[PDB]
């Protein structure tokens, strides 16, 4: 019961690498949404500042 052990480890490590990339893309997308939402929040506040 060792021929599958080599298969389980390689499939696991490949899955980890793909999950790393997904987490990086999630953090990047959340960072972009935060910036625009806040940059659009000040555009609305300053609009009340000129009215």
């Amino acid at each position: 019961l060792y021929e599958n052990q080599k298969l389980i480890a390689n499939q696991f490590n490949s899955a980890i690498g793909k999950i790393q990339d997904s987490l990086s893309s999630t953090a990047s997308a959340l960072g972009k949404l935060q910036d625009v939402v806040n940059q659009n929040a000040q555009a609305l506040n300053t609009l009340v500042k000129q009215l």
């Binding site: 696991f12 490590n13 790393q20 987490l23 990086s24």
Partner: peptide, 13 residues
């Protein structure tokens, strides 16, 4: 999220 992404390499077999 970025921290977990880095630490997942510690789980590599």
């Amino acid at each position: 999220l970025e921290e977990v992404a880095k630490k997942l390499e510690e789980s590599l077999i």
